[PDB]
C-alpha cells in the first residue's frame, strides 16, 4: 500500500514488485554394516531349537 | 606551534534525530471531507494512467 | 496533454486588487517551474525585475524565453488557476494591454519584456509584498523594430560619451525614443546607463559582421555606385548624388562571376544564422481574430 | 600449387592493378561509375565474401545438433560469392 | 458496526467506467454471420456519428502519437549486427547509385572515419576501409567543409531485419520513439558518455527550470580533424549557440594558421542542429555496452520526442 501526498511533487505511483526465492536441497546419508554371516543364515531354515 | 597574534571563536551547527510527542485536545479542529474525483492523466502506448 | 496549474497564496485576496486582476483574465505570464503546486513569487515576472534595480532588457528576454509561459485562467480568493503552453496545442487567447496594439489575421506574435511602462503591466500585491509582472505580446514587426531600437541605443549610449550635446539630444531620443503606429506614437523607457548582458548579443554581432565584411561581393557595389549617380530611386533617396568614397576604394578591381559565386554561397550560409540572434522571443501564430471581442486564437 | 601468380603486376598488395582498382587510392574518383574489377580487387569486399561463405557452410554444418538467427541467402552475384569469373 | 470509511468506491468505479473508451471494432471475415453482424454494427455507427439531427449521435466528447517510420537499407559491413537499438544514426547521400546501399552512419563510425573509445570502436570495426569507400571525398569534404550538409540526421533505429549483405532498418523520424511488433512498446536513446558535454553544468537569482530539455548536435573542424558533439541543454535556441561559441573559443583560437586569406570556403567553425526534446528535472542514466570489447560508458535518456533540425553556422 501507499499514501496519498498533497505537495507539489508528482503523485506517488502504486507499487507491485516481484520477489523470487530459491529452493535449497539437502541430502543426508547414513552408513550401516551387516556381517556376511548375519546375512547368510537368513536363507537357511532352522528347525532345532 | 607558536601562538598567533590573536584568539578565535569557532561556531558549528548540530542536528539531532529526536522522537517527539504530540498532544491535541478534543474537538480542536473541524474537518470537512470532500468527494473524490477522477481524471485520466495519459493514454500510454502500453497502459492507461488515472 | 492536459495541464492545469494551481498557485496557492498564503495571505488573503485583499479585494482592492482582485478587480484589476479579474479584468486581467486570459493573459500571458511566465512561471518558474512546471509543477502542480507553485510558489507565489516565482509566478509573475517580479523576480527578474526589481523596482530599485536598473532595467537590462536583454536579461529580461533571456529569463522570459527560458521560463514556461502560462495563460491566466481564473483568480480565486486564495487560488490562481492557470493552464500552461504545451508546445503542440491550440488554445484561445484574449488580451488587454494599456499600450494597446491592434492585431491582424495570421500575424505572428512575439513575447517581450514590458519595456514601455512598469506601472502598466505590473500589479502590486503588497499583501504578500509581491508584484505580478506581465510580459508584453506584440505583433512581430513592432517587436523586432523595438528590439533593434534597444540594441542600437545600447550601442550609441556607449558612443555618445564625451561628444557635443547635439549628439546627446538627437540620437539618444529621436529614433531610439519613440515607436510609431497608425496615427499613434508610444514612448519607450530607456536605461539611464548602458546595461551589461545586453551587449553580449552585440559581441556576436561584431563577429558575424567581421566575417561577413570579409566576404562582401563586388558587382552589387558597382550597380549601386552607378544607380545613385545616373538615376533616381526612392530606396536610393538615402544616398544623395555623393557616394561614400569607401565604396570607390573597395570597388577598384574588376569583376569575375566565379569569385562572386563562392562569396555569395558563404554569405547565404552566414545569413541563415542571424535568425537565432534576432528572434529572442517565443512566437505565436494567429489563426483567427475578432475585434468585437479582442479574443484571438494563437498557436 | 606449382605457381603462385599468373601476373605479378596485379595480384599483389601494392601492384599496378591494385593501385588502379582497390578501395585504397580511389578517393579522388568521381562517384557513380560502375567498375567491374571492384568486386575482385577491393580487399574488404573479398574478406566479407569469404567470411560469409565460411559462415554459411559452418552454420549449416554445426547446426542440426541456442538461438537460430535466420540467414538470408541469394544468388544474383555468384561471381562475387565464389571469386570466379567465367 | 464498521465505520464505512471516508471515501466511497462506487463513485470511483462509476467515474472510471465512464472514462474508458469504447472498444475497437474487430471485423470477422472467415465466418459469414459474424461478418454480416459487424457490418450491421458499422452502418449503425456511421449513422450514430454523422447526423447533426440527434444529440446522442454527438460522440466527440473526450492522442495519435506513434512515430513516423522510415525504412532504410544498408550494407552489413557499414553496421554491426550487435549495435544497440535506439542509437541515433546519421545518413549520407550517394550520387548516382542509391538503391544499392543507403550508407547510414553511427556515431562510433563517425569517430572512426574522423580518426578507450578508440579501442571499442576498433573492436567493432577492425578494417573500416569500406567506411572510407562510403565517402570518397572525405579528405576533400573535410576541407570543403561541406561535410555537415550531407550528413543528415535520421535519429534512433527501432528494428533491423538481418541479412547477409543488406540490412533492413526502421528509423524514427518525427514524433516519440515507439515500436510496432506489439502494442507499441517504447524504446530509449543512447549516446556515449564521453564525447558528450553537459552545457547546463559547464557554467556551474535562481535560474528558472523549463519543462522540456533539448538535445543539439554540432560538427567542428579542429586542427585535430573534425569531431562531433551533442549537447543536453534547456535554455533556448537563441542562447545555446552563444554559450556554445563561448565554449569553443579556446579551440577557435587555434584556427588562425589553417584559415586561408584568399579562399573563404574553409572559415566556418561548425554547425548546430536540434535533434529532439526530452523530460527535464530527471537527468539521464549510466550504462556500459555489453559487447566483446565493451568499455565505453554511455548516457541513455528516456522520453525522446524526435524533432530533427538543420545545421546552422556558428563562428
mmCIF file of N, CA and C in Angstrom, chain C residues 171-247:
data_model
loop_
_atom_site.group_PDB
_atom_site.id
_atom_site.type_symbol
_atom_site.label_atom_id
_atom_site.label_comp_id
_atom_site.label_asym_id
_atom_site.label_seq_id
_atom_site.Cartn_x
_atom_site.Cartn_y
_atom_site.Cartn_z
ATOM 1 N N UNK C 171 20.320 61.559 -31.300
ATOM 2 C CA UNK C 171 20.290 60.112 -31.486
ATOM 3 C C UNK C 171 19.744 59.417 -30.249
ATOM 4 N N UNK C 172 20.006 59.980 -29.072
ATOM 5 C CA UNK C 172 19.588 59.341 -27.837
ATOM 6 C C UNK C 172 18.072 59.379 -27.660
ATOM 7 N N UNK C 173 17.370 60.331 -28.286
ATOM 8 C CA UNK C 173 15.931 60.403 -28.057
ATOM 9 C C UNK C 173 15.125 60.866 -29.268
ATOM 10 N N UNK C 174 15.622 60.692 -30.490
ATOM 11 C CA UNK C 174 14.808 60.955 -31.670
ATOM 12 C C UNK C 174 14.301 59.664 -32.295
ATOM 13 N N UNK C 175 15.196 58.725 -32.576
ATOM 14 C CA UNK C 175 14.813 57.432 -33.121
ATOM 15 C C UNK C 175 14.814 56.325 -32.087
ATOM 16 N N UNK C 176 15.689 56.408 -31.094
ATOM 17 C CA UNK C 176 15.733 55.404 -30.045
ATOM 18 C C UNK C 176 14.699 55.649 -28.953
ATOM 19 N N UNK C 177 13.889 56.695 -29.077
ATOM 20 C CA UNK C 177 12.950 57.042 -28.032
ATOM 21 C C UNK C 177 11.519 56.598 -28.253
ATOM 22 N N UNK C 178 10.996 56.796 -29.457
ATOM 23 C CA UNK C 178 9.582 56.595 -29.728
ATOM 24 C C UNK C 178 9.374 55.551 -30.814
ATOM 25 N N UNK C 179 8.222 54.891 -30.760
ATOM 26 C CA UNK C 179 7.826 53.889 -31.740
ATOM 27 C C UNK C 179 6.443 54.262 -32.252
ATOM 28 N N UNK C 180 6.317 54.361 -33.567
ATOM 29 C CA UNK C 180 5.099 54.831 -34.198
ATOM 30 C C UNK C 180 4.159 53.681 -34.539
ATOM 31 N N UNK C 181 2.913 54.053 -34.796
ATOM 32 C CA UNK C 181 1.850 53.158 -35.209
ATOM 33 C C UNK C 181 0.861 54.015 -35.980
ATOM 34 N N UNK C 182 -0.215 53.397 -36.459
ATOM 35 C CA UNK C 182 -1.111 54.129 -37.345
ATOM 36 C C UNK C 182 -1.722 55.312 -36.605
ATOM 37 N N UNK C 183 -1.235 56.508 -36.919
ATOM 38 C CA UNK C 183 -1.650 57.706 -36.207
ATOM 39 C C UNK C 183 -1.409 57.631 -34.717
ATOM 40 N N UNK C 184 -0.296 57.036 -34.306
ATOM 41 C CA UNK C 184 -0.075 56.804 -32.889
ATOM 42 C C UNK C 184 1.421 56.798 -32.632
ATOM 43 N N UNK C 185 1.798 57.128 -31.399
ATOM 44 C CA UNK C 185 3.207 57.180 -31.036
ATOM 45 C C UNK C 185 3.366 56.858 -29.562
ATOM 46 N N UNK C 186 4.150 55.825 -29.269
ATOM 47 C CA UNK C 186 4.396 55.387 -27.905
ATOM 48 C C UNK C 186 5.856 55.613 -27.546
ATOM 49 N N UNK C 187 6.094 56.206 -26.383
ATOM 50 C CA UNK C 187 7.462 56.374 -25.927
ATOM 51 C C UNK C 187 7.995 55.066 -25.362
ATOM 52 N N UNK C 188 9.305 55.028 -25.160
ATOM 53 C CA UNK C 188 9.963 53.877 -24.572
ATOM 54 C C UNK C 188 10.660 54.284 -23.286
ATOM 55 N N UNK C 189 10.798 53.324 -22.378
ATOM 56 C CA UNK C 189 11.646 53.514 -21.217
ATOM 57 C C UNK C 189 13.092 53.281 -21.617
ATOM 58 N N UNK C 190 13.956 54.185 -21.213
ATOM 59 C CA UNK C 190 15.316 53.973 -21.661
ATOM 60 C C UNK C 190 16.240 53.747 -20.477
ATOM 61 N N UNK C 191 17.147 52.778 -20.562
ATOM 62 C CA UNK C 191 18.105 52.576 -19.470
ATOM 63 C C UNK C 191 19.009 53.789 -19.337
ATOM 64 N N UNK C 192 19.007 54.386 -18.145
ATOM 65 C CA UNK C 192 19.763 55.615 -17.934
ATOM 66 C C UNK C 192 21.234 55.416 -18.267
ATOM 67 N N UNK C 193 21.782 54.258 -17.914
ATOM 68 C CA UNK C 193 23.170 53.909 -18.202
ATOM 69 C C UNK C 193 23.170 52.642 -19.052
ATOM 70 N N UNK C 194 24.175 52.432 -19.902
ATOM 71 C CA UNK C 194 24.214 51.207 -20.713
ATOM 72 C C UNK C 194 24.248 49.966 -19.836
ATOM 73 N N UNK C 195 23.402 48.996 -20.173
ATOM 74 C CA UNK C 195 23.268 47.799 -19.383
ATOM 75 C C UNK C 195 24.205 46.687 -19.801
ATOM 76 N N UNK C 196 24.764 45.983 -18.821
ATOM 77 C CA UNK C 196 25.520 44.771 -19.131
ATOM 78 C C UNK C 196 24.584 43.676 -19.614
ATOM 79 N N UNK C 197 25.183 42.651 -20.220
ATOM 80 C CA UNK C 197 24.477 41.460 -20.689
ATOM 81 C C UNK C 197 23.622 41.770 -21.912
ATOM 82 N N UNK C 198 23.480 43.046 -22.243
ATOM 83 C CA UNK C 198 22.836 43.409 -23.485
ATOM 84 C C UNK C 198 23.802 43.344 -24.643
ATOM 85 N N UNK C 199 24.984 43.927 -24.454
ATOM 86 C CA UNK C 199 25.998 43.915 -25.498
ATOM 87 C C UNK C 199 26.563 42.525 -25.732
ATOM 88 N N UNK C 200 26.280 41.572 -24.840
ATOM 89 C CA UNK C 200 26.688 40.187 -25.070
ATOM 90 C C UNK C 200 26.133 39.666 -26.387
ATOM 91 N N UNK C 201 24.983 40.195 -26.808
ATOM 92 C CA UNK C 201 24.494 39.971 -28.163
ATOM 93 C C UNK C 201 25.354 40.710 -29.184
ATOM 94 N N UNK C 202 25.786 41.919 -28.837
ATOM 95 C CA UNK C 202 26.496 42.757 -29.792
ATOM 96 C C UNK C 202 27.887 42.214 -30.109
ATOM 97 N N UNK C 203 28.519 41.519 -29.163
ATOM 98 C CA UNK C 203 29.810 40.896 -29.453
ATOM 99 C C UNK C 203 29.681 39.888 -30.587
ATOM 100 N N UNK C 204 28.692 39.000 -30.481
ATOM 101 C CA UNK C 204 28.425 38.058 -31.559
ATOM 102 C C UNK C 204 28.075 38.790 -32.843
ATOM 103 N N UNK C 205 27.327 39.888 -32.728
ATOM 104 C CA UNK C 205 27.044 40.692 -33.913
ATOM 105 C C UNK C 205 28.326 41.165 -34.579
ATOM 106 N N UNK C 206 29.271 41.668 -33.790
ATOM 107 C CA UNK C 206 30.528 42.135 -34.359
ATOM 108 C C UNK C 206 31.288 40.990 -35.006
ATOM 109 N N UNK C 207 31.223 39.804 -34.407
ATOM 110 C CA UNK C 207 31.877 38.642 -35.004
ATOM 111 C C UNK C 207 31.294 38.330 -36.379
ATOM 112 N N UNK C 208 29.967 38.219 -36.456
ATOM 113 C CA UNK C 208 29.331 37.970 -37.746
ATOM 114 C C UNK C 208 29.639 39.090 -38.727
ATOM 115 N N UNK C 209 29.719 40.331 -38.242
ATOM 116 C CA UNK C 209 29.959 41.453 -39.138
ATOM 117 C C UNK C 209 31.373 41.417 -39.706
ATOM 118 N N UNK C 210 32.362 41.057 -38.887
ATOM 119 C CA UNK C 210 33.716 40.873 -39.399
ATOM 120 C C UNK C 210 33.746 39.781 -40.460
ATOM 121 N N UNK C 211 33.126 38.638 -40.154
ATOM 122 C CA UNK C 211 33.164 37.509 -41.080
ATOM 123 C C UNK C 211 32.439 37.842 -42.378
ATOM 124 N N UNK C 212 31.314 38.553 -42.288
ATOM 125 C CA UNK C 212 30.555 38.922 -43.478
ATOM 126 C C UNK C 212 31.289 39.970 -44.300
ATOM 127 N N UNK C 213 31.860 40.979 -43.640
ATOM 128 C CA UNK C 213 32.551 42.049 -44.344
ATOM 129 C C UNK C 213 33.877 41.585 -44.913
ATOM 130 N N UNK C 214 34.334 40.391 -44.538
ATOM 131 C CA UNK C 214 35.445 39.793 -45.265
ATOM 132 C C UNK C 214 35.015 39.231 -46.619
ATOM 133 N N UNK C 215 33.730 38.911 -46.794
ATOM 134 C CA UNK C 215 33.257 38.229 -47.994
ATOM 135 C C UNK C 215 32.198 39.014 -48.767
ATOM 136 N N UNK C 216 32.217 40.331 -48.698
ATOM 137 C CA UNK C 216 31.218 41.066 -49.456
ATOM 138 C C UNK C 216 31.492 40.957 -50.954
ATOM 139 N N UNK C 217 30.448 40.928 -51.774
ATOM 140 C CA UNK C 217 30.635 40.887 -53.225
ATOM 141 C C UNK C 217 30.971 42.257 -53.806
ATOM 142 N N UNK C 218 31.377 42.236 -55.075
ATOM 143 C CA UNK C 218 31.843 43.424 -55.778
ATOM 144 C C UNK C 218 30.809 44.015 -56.727
ATOM 145 N N UNK C 219 30.076 43.178 -57.463
ATOM 146 C CA UNK C 219 29.205 43.693 -58.514
ATOM 147 C C UNK C 219 28.076 44.539 -57.954
ATOM 148 N N UNK C 220 27.550 44.165 -56.790
ATOM 149 C CA UNK C 220 26.484 44.946 -56.179
ATOM 150 C C UNK C 220 26.944 46.366 -55.895
ATOM 151 N N UNK C 221 28.179 46.514 -55.418
ATOM 152 C CA UNK C 221 28.709 47.845 -55.163
ATOM 153 C C UNK C 221 28.780 48.653 -56.447
ATOM 154 N N UNK C 222 29.159 48.015 -57.554
ATOM 155 C CA UNK C 222 29.207 48.733 -58.822
ATOM 156 C C UNK C 222 27.814 49.147 -59.268
ATOM 157 N N UNK C 223 26.839 48.247 -59.127
ATOM 158 C CA UNK C 223 25.474 48.575 -59.519
ATOM 159 C C UNK C 223 24.967 49.772 -58.737
ATOM 160 N N UNK C 224 25.165 49.756 -57.420
ATOM 161 C CA UNK C 224 24.671 50.844 -56.584
ATOM 162 C C UNK C 224 25.405 52.140 -56.902
ATOM 163 N N UNK C 225 26.730 52.067 -57.062
ATOM 164 C CA UNK C 225 27.504 53.259 -57.370
ATOM 165 C C UNK C 225 27.090 53.853 -58.707
ATOM 166 N N UNK C 226 26.590 53.025 -59.616
ATOM 167 C CA UNK C 226 26.062 53.540 -60.864
ATOM 168 C C UNK C 226 24.676 54.131 -60.723
ATOM 169 N N UNK C 227 23.807 53.430 -59.997
ATOM 170 C CA UNK C 227 22.416 53.842 -59.902
ATOM 171 C C UNK C 227 22.231 55.095 -59.066
ATOM 172 N N UNK C 228 23.134 55.374 -58.128
ATOM 173 C CA UNK C 228 22.965 56.587 -57.337
ATOM 174 C C UNK C 228 23.274 57.816 -58.176
ATOM 175 N N UNK C 229 24.231 57.709 -59.094
ATOM 176 C CA UNK C 229 24.640 58.880 -59.857
ATOM 177 C C UNK C 229 23.819 59.059 -61.125
ATOM 178 N N UNK C 230 23.592 57.980 -61.875
ATOM 179 C CA UNK C 230 22.920 58.130 -63.158
ATOM 180 C C UNK C 230 21.407 58.253 -63.022
ATOM 181 N N UNK C 231 20.807 57.608 -62.026
ATOM 182 C CA UNK C 231 19.357 57.515 -61.936
ATOM 183 C C UNK C 231 18.894 57.963 -60.556
ATOM 184 N N UNK C 232 17.574 58.001 -60.376
ATOM 185 C CA UNK C 232 16.944 58.377 -59.118
ATOM 186 C C UNK C 232 16.008 57.267 -58.673
ATOM 187 N N UNK C 233 16.070 56.918 -57.389
ATOM 188 C CA UNK C 233 15.179 55.918 -56.824
ATOM 189 C C UNK C 233 14.816 56.305 -55.400
ATOM 190 N N UNK C 234 13.660 55.816 -54.954
ATOM 191 C CA UNK C 234 13.228 56.107 -53.593
ATOM 192 C C UNK C 234 14.109 55.397 -52.577
ATOM 193 N N UNK C 235 14.393 54.112 -52.798
ATOM 194 C CA UNK C 235 15.339 53.421 -51.931
ATOM 195 C C UNK C 235 16.698 54.097 -51.963
ATOM 196 N N UNK C 236 17.036 54.736 -53.079
ATOM 197 C CA UNK C 236 18.275 55.484 -53.204
ATOM 198 C C UNK C 236 18.105 56.960 -52.884
ATOM 199 N N UNK C 237 16.994 57.343 -52.258
ATOM 200 C CA UNK C 237 16.913 58.697 -51.734
ATOM 201 C C UNK C 237 17.889 58.880 -50.583
ATOM 202 N N UNK C 238 18.136 57.806 -49.830
ATOM 203 C CA UNK C 238 19.093 57.851 -48.724
ATOM 204 C C UNK C 238 20.427 58.401 -49.187
ATOM 205 N N UNK C 239 21.045 57.743 -50.157
ATOM 206 C CA UNK C 239 22.293 58.221 -50.724
ATOM 207 C C UNK C 239 21.955 59.377 -51.650
ATOM 208 N N UNK C 240 22.626 60.506 -51.459
ATOM 209 C CA UNK C 240 22.468 61.585 -52.421
ATOM 210 C C UNK C 240 23.404 61.338 -53.592
ATOM 211 N N UNK C 241 23.557 62.336 -54.455
ATOM 212 C CA UNK C 241 24.445 62.188 -55.598
ATOM 213 C C UNK C 241 25.861 61.837 -55.162
ATOM 214 N N UNK C 242 26.298 62.341 -54.008
ATOM 215 C CA UNK C 242 27.610 61.988 -53.487
ATOM 216 C C UNK C 242 27.614 60.556 -52.971
ATOM 217 N N UNK C 243 28.733 59.877 -53.192
ATOM 218 C CA UNK C 243 28.893 58.488 -52.770
ATOM 219 C C UNK C 243 29.866 58.464 -51.598
ATOM 220 N N UNK C 244 29.687 57.574 -50.627
ATOM 221 C CA UNK C 244 30.764 57.329 -49.667
ATOM 222 C C UNK C 244 31.965 56.726 -50.377
ATOM 223 N N UNK C 245 33.099 57.417 -50.270
ATOM 224 C CA UNK C 245 34.283 57.071 -51.045
ATOM 225 C C UNK C 245 34.847 55.705 -50.677
ATOM 226 N N UNK C 246 34.440 55.154 -49.535
ATOM 227 C CA UNK C 246 34.799 53.785 -49.188
ATOM 228 C C UNK C 246 34.448 52.827 -50.317
ATOM 229 N N UNK C 247 33.255 52.992 -50.888
ATOM 230 C CA UNK C 247 32.819 52.118 -51.966
ATOM 231 C C UNK C 247 33.712 52.292 -53.181
#
